[PDB]
């Protein structure tokens, strides 16, 4: 129905919010510490020395195990 | 249709996976370090001394800013 189409779009938007903001291909699973922005996959996070959201120094990357994975 | 019901269930489960595993009311926004389990809100994470998923000693709680918040 039309409601199936509406729900597919909502699901797509929620899944896109869970994808890395740099590569757009892999799920977010890494936090830039200490700022806390959790916006990248592990491969993109390993290549950034400054946060892409707030520009703070990345002291280290913490892997996050999320229930939505 | 039955497809609409399947998608509604997927959306519900994804939304439930973003809620704190202790209070079931507030969004997850905290990571237990060093293990990385990210399953609680700030208030519930604050006094836990051991991770509720893996039993590891909690050395630090890192706040996380997720795009799904
Ligand atoms: Zn990436
Ligand atoms: Zn940041
Ligand atoms: Zn809680
Ligand atoms: Zn743990």
From Swiss-Prot, chains A, B:
Critical for homodimerization, as annotated region: 64-66
Highest rank taxon of the organism: Eukaryota
Subcellular location: Cytoplasm; Cell membrane
PTM entry text: Autoubiquitinated.
Induction: Expression is directly activated by NR1H2 and NR1H3. Expression is not dependent of the sterol-response element-binding proteins (SREBPs). Expression is indirectly induced by LDL.
Tissue-level expression: Ubiquitously expressed.
ZnF locations on chain (RING-type): 20-55
Biological role stated in the UniProt entry: E3 ubiquitin-protein ligase that mediates ubiquitination and subsequent proteasomal degradation of myosin regulatory light chain (MRLC), LDLR, VLDLR and LRP8. Activity depends on E2 enzymes of the UBE2D family. Proteasomal degradation of MRLC leads to inhibit neurite outgrowth in presence of NGF by counteracting the stabilization of MRLC by saposin-like protein (CNPY2/MSAP) and reducing CNPY2-stimulated neurite outgrowth. Acts as a sterol-dependent inhibitor of cellular cholesterol uptake by mediating ubiquitination and subsequent degradation of LDLR.
Oligomeric and partner information: Homodimer. Interacts with the E2 ubiquitin-conjugating enzyme, UBE2D1 (via RING-type zinc finger). Interacts with myosin regulatory light chain (MRLC) and TMEM4.
Domain notes: The RING domain mediates ubiquitination and the neurite outgrowth inhibitory activity.
Protein name as annotated: E3 ubiquitin-protein ligase MYLIP
Organism: Homo sapiens (Human)
Lineage start: Eukaryota, Metazoa, Chordata, Craniata, Vertebrata
